[PDB]
Amino acid sequence: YDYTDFINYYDKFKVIVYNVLKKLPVIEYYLNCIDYNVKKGKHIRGKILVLISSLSSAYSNIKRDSIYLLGWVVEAIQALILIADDIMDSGKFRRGAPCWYIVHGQSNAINDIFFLKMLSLSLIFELSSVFGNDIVMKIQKIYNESIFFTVLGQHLDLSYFDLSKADKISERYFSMVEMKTSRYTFYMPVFFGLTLSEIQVSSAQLNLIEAILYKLGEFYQVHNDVSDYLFNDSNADDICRFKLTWPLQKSFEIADEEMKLKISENYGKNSSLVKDCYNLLKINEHYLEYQRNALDYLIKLVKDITDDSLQKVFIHLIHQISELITNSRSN
Amino acid sequence: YDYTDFINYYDKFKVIVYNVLKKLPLNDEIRKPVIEYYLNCIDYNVKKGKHIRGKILVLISSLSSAYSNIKRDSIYLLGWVVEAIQALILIADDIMDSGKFRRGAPCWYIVHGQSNAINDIFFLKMLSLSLIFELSSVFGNDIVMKIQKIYNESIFFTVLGQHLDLSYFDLSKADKISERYFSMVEMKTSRYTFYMPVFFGLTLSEIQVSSAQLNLIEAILYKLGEFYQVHNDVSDYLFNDSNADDICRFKLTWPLQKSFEIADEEMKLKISENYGKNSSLVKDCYNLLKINEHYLEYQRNALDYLIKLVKDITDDSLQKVFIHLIHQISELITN
Numbered sequence: 291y292d293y294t295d296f297i298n299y300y301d302k303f304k305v306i307v308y309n310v311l312k313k314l315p316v317i318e319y320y321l322n323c324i325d326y327n328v329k330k331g332k333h334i335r336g337k338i339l340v341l342i343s344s345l346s347s348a349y350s351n352i353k354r355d356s357i358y359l360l361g362w363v364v365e366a367i368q369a370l371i372l373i374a375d376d377i378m379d380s381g382k383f384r385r386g387a388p389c390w391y392i393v394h395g396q397s398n399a400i401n402d403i404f405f406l407k408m409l410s411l412s413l414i415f416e417l418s419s420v421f422g423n424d425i426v427m428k429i430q431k432i433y434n435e436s437i438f439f440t441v442l443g444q445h446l447d448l449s450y451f452d453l454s455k456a457d458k459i460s461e462r463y464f465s466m467v468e469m470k471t472s473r474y475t476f477y478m479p480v481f482f483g484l485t486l487s488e489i490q491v492s493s494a495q496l497n498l499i500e501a502i503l504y505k506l507g508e509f510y511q512v513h514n515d516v517s518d519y520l521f522n523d524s525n526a527d528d529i530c531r532f533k534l535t536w537p538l539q540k541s542f543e544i545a546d547e548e549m550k551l552k553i554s555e556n557y558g559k560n561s562s563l564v565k566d567c568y569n570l571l572k573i574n575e576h577y578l579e580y581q582r583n584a585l586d587y588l589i590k591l592v593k594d595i596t597d598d599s600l601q602k603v604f605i606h607l608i609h610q611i612s613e614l615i616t617n618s619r620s621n
Numbered sequence: 622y623d624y625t626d627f628i629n630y631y632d633k634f635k636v637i638v639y640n641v642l643k644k645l646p647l648n649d650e651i652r653k654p655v656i657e658y659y660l661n662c663i664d665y666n667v668k669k670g671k672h673i674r675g676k677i678l679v680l681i682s683s684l685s686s687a688y689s690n691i692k693r694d695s696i697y698l699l700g701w702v703v704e705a706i707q708a709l710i711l712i713a714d715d716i717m718d719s720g721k722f723r724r725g726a727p728c729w730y731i732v733h734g735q736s737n738a739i740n741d742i743f744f745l746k747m748l749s750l751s752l753i754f755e756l757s758s759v760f761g762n763d764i765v766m767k768i769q770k771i772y773n774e775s776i777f778f779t780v781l782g783q784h785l786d787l788s789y790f791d792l793s794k795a796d797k798i799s800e801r802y803f804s805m806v807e808m809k810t811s812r813y814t815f816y817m818p819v820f821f822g823l824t825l826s827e828i829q830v831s832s833a834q835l836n837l838i839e840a841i842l843y844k845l846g847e848f849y850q851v852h853n854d855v856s857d858y859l860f861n862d863s864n865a866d867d868i869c870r871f872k873l874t875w876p877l878q879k880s881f882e883i884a885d886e887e888m889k890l891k892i893s894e895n896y897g898k899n900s901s902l903v904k905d906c907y908n909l910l911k912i913n914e915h916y917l918e919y920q921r922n923a924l925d926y927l928i929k930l931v932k933d934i935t936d937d938s939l940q941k942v943f944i945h946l947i948h949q950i951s952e953l954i955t956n
């Protein structure tokens with residue numbers, strides 16, 4: 291898909307950030323800050339905004355530029371969340387490049403989160419002249435609910451669980467995942483798209499596709515979690531960082547009372563032994579039947595969308611995310 | 622002014638906060654001591670302080686258009702929103718600056734760690750955002766969009782002001798040291814400390830249409846902002862001797878710029894070489910030159926220009942609010 295000239299609007303997006311910086315060295319700093327954190331990447335979430343904006347809306351106005359801007363606002367929102375995540379999680383690299391807090395220091399990274407946010411806020415606020423109040427208003431409500439949940443989701447990510455009390459530690463996983471990841475990644479860009487378009491209207495037909503974004507997000511984080519276990523070797527990984535994650539969630543689900551003991555002990559000092567078990571528990575295997583069932587259930591759900599115009603972009607959506615996750619390091 | 626009713630709204634605000642945080646249905650909500658984490662966060666960060674800016678907004682809003690009932694609570698609420706804004710800004714500032722105490726108590730980042738401190742900042746940001754969206758039902762959309770525009774402008778200026786505050790490259794030969802500082806300070810302090818609550822206050826009061834010399838008020842709040850920060854800086858030079866402070870941190874300070882207007886080529890080497898290495902020695906030159914001296918001259922002219930400016934306000938009603946403001950600020954600075 292393209293998505294071109296969504297990417298190419300970056301140029302025009304930079305100029306709008308540049309002209310907002312009439313306050314009146316710092317411009318150069320923050321222009322580079324957005325180049326480092328917003329320019330880099332696949333831009334999946336800003337891409338979800340254009341897709342949904344696509345069949346849903348009918349060619350009338352030059353809101354298209356405005357839709358692209360908002361597609362870059364979502365990218366700055368994603369970026370600022372990740373610069374904040376890499377600090378807490380002692381991240382080393384992201385998007386093939388050292389984390390912003392490493393190149394620029396922690397104090398500047400914290401302040402820079404504040405920059406992107408207010409930038410985000412300001413570019414939104416100035417979409418009133420294009421879609422008017424109602425649209426902007428409905429867009430700002432989505433924004434608030436999205437990040438609010440991500441923060442609480444992130445809080446749960448920081449809040450240590452009770453490994454011994456693993457009766458519904460899985461219930462704590464998915465809930466957390468819905469909070470921290472699922473919302474901003476999927477709910478936010480889509481609902482931002484649904485608004486700009488003003489699709490007409492299937493409101494009662496909104497929970498279904500809501501259940502779609504909940505699984506898309508679950509699926510996204512679940513695979514994120516396995517990759518770390520599968521390819522990260524360090525003392526600043528999920529296990530060495532004592533984090534509630536899909537492999538540990540499942541392990542406690544599949545393991546005898548003798549292996550869950552070996553994991554509770556070494557979590558998390560020796561990540562070595564924790565993974566040893568994951569292999570004898572064949573977690574990797576279990577994620578594959580997940581990945582498998584994840585796909586078709588989304589198709590099940592997709593096949594039920596009534597609009598038949600909303601189902602088109604949601605057909606691309608399911609594809610785009612699954613291709614992201616299955617066309618990885620395969621071997 | 623018997624600011625007491627506002628302070629007593631805290632319970633309703635906290636009720637309004639607890640009521641929102643209903644995030645999970647279906648289940649018994651076994652995973653919600655999250656609420657008890659953040660209720661504690663609010664008690665720890667927003668309840669403490671002395672609550673100045675909050676007061677400023679309520680004072681303003683009520684004084685240029687007094688509410689009689691109902692809208693008052695939405696003014697009190699916002700004033701508590703203001704407070705949660707200032708708190709989140711200072712939690713971030715204390716991390717960046719390695720602070721130890723705030724509002725009497727130990728810094729939130731120390732107590733709960735900086736991974737949580739950063740997350741908790743944007744809890745308060747997002748709550749404040751969603752709470753300011755609350756007023757829509759009471760004041761209307763055009764009044765909310767105006768609030769939001771003020772919120773944005775103000776925190777955005779502070780963010781770039783904090784960047785200039787963190788600015789690593791502060792060279793030797795600097796003539797713009799006073800320009801870089803007073804601008805820095807305009808951006809990081811002047812905007813949000815007194816502009817934000819006063820421009821919140823008088824959006825809610827919505828009175829009146831004075832547009833021409835409504836710059837005059839901005840010229841007062843600026844002076845008041847830098848006035849407040851210049852004190853903060855002096856106080857740092859005077860009242861601590863920790864193993865590491867504002868000079869151990871190469872921070873652009875008031876005792877540093879007005880020390881580069883009076884000193885000599887030779888003394889401009891003492892301060893330069895020992896900055897971020899030995900506060901004592903750097904404090905001795907300050908001492909020689911007597912920074913607290915010319916700081917007194919500063920306050921005099923600062924209150925002189927301030928008072929003369931307030932004599933020019935068009936509304937004798939606003940004028941008194943502004944005189945009262947500056948009086949409460951000057952004194953409070955003198956605590």
Ligand SMILES: O=P(O)(O)C(O)(Cc1cccnc1)P(=O)(O)O
Pocket residue numbers: 371372375376379381470471511514518
């Ligand atoms: O990419 P990362 O850092 O593995 C992660 O997925 C990024 C992230 C941050 C915030 C919300 N959701 C996911 P995390 O959750 O920190 O494991």
Ligand SMILES: O=P(O)(O)C(O)(Cc1cccnc1)P(=O)(O)O
Pocket residue numbers: 710711714718720783809810850853
């Ligand atoms: O109270 P502090 O930390 O002395 C200070 O005034 C707090 C502060 C932070 C942000 C804006 N204005 C003041 P700083 O500026 O860090 O010296």
Ligand SMILES: [Mg+2]
Pocket residue numbers: 375376379381
């Ligand atoms: Mg991470």
Ligand SMILES: [Mg+2]
Pocket residue numbers: 375379447
């Ligand atoms: Mg994490």
Ligand SMILES: [Mg+2]
Pocket residue numbers: 514515518
């Ligand atoms: Mg991960």
Ligand SMILES: [Mg+2]
Pocket residue numbers: 714715718720
């Ligand atoms: Mg400080």
Ligand SMILES: [Mg+2]
Pocket residue numbers: 714717718786
């Ligand atoms: Mg500071």
Ligand SMILES: [Mg+2]
Pocket residue numbers: 853854857
């Ligand atoms: Mg200070």
